[PDB]
């Protein structure tokens, strides 16, 4: 496993430097986070400089989507089949309380819990709100 690359991050801040939460940021966010783990996605978000209010908004986002995931995805009671992974909560999909190893384990499972794709969805939803505000 290789983490998101230095050049990918350059491509990602180049988008932001030039486009900055115009509609175009979203498809490039989406293509650049290709195969990203929740840990990659937070490395992306933590790289953005210069847009402090937008990043706050986005994180606030994040949190709403995480609280909601947990409401709609109640955990099943009593210990699980041969240690084959706890179910991820919102804070785990968001890479806050999960481990790279956990993130990958979910991601590669049969069948797969795509915790990167789910996280990317919440970020895209937050970026849609930012674009709507700044247009």
């Amino acid at each position: 496993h290789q983490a998101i690359s230095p050049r990918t991050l350059n491509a990602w801040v180049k988008v932001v430097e030039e486009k900055a939460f115009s509609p175009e940021v979203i498809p490039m966010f989406s293509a650049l986070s290709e195969g990203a783990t929740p840990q990659d996605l937070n490395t992306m978000l933590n790289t953005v400089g210069g847009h402090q209010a937008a990043m706050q908004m986005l994180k606030e986002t994040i949190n709403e989507e995480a609280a909601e995931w947990d409401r709609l995805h109640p955990v099943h009671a009593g210990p699980i089949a041969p240690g084959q992974m706890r179910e991820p909560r919102g804070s785990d999909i968001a890479g806050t309380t999960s481990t790279l190893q956990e993130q990958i384990g979910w991601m590669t499972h049969n069948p797969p819990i795509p915790v990167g794709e789910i996280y990317k969805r919440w970020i895209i939803l937050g970026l849609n709100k930012i674009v709507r505000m700044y247009s």
Partner: peptide, 23 residues
């Protein structure tokens, strides 16, 4: 760093500096 839309808060730690050197 900010001019290039790169988070200057990364300067605060070894890992952040390291990140940016790679970039």
């Amino acid at each position: 760093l900010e001019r290039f839309a790169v988070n200057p808060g990364l300067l605060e730690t070894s890992e952040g500096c390291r990140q940016i050197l790679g970039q």
